[PDB]
Design a protein around this nucleic acid. Structure first.
Length: 50
DNA sequence: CAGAATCAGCCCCAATGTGTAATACCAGATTTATGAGCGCCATGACCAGCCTCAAT
């Protein structure tokens, strides 16, 4: 739910993008892995107050 | 000329407004909590080539 009124489910997103649900899942997992890769999001890691 | 009436002037009585510096039971109806169940977005496991390199 980023920069929009509401979020969209994975199936509606796949339908809008003409991409299967599993391919959408794999692309999301690749994006999450790339964000978990180091040398990035250092301020995001610093955003924890514990 | 003195009389008292109905109007302004005057006066007594009531009213509000102020007061600082950090019982009993009976019956009939309703609802929240545990009963399971359909159904599913998303977890874990494959599995075909287009996209990305090598030797001659």
């Amino acid at each position: 739910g980023i920069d929009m009124n509401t979020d969209y489910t994975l199936e509606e997103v796949g339908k809008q993008f003409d991409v299967t649900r599993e391919r959408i899942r794999q692309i999301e997992a690749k994006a999450l892995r790339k964000l978990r890769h180091p040398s990035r999001s250092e301020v995001l890691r610093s955003f924890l107050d514990d």
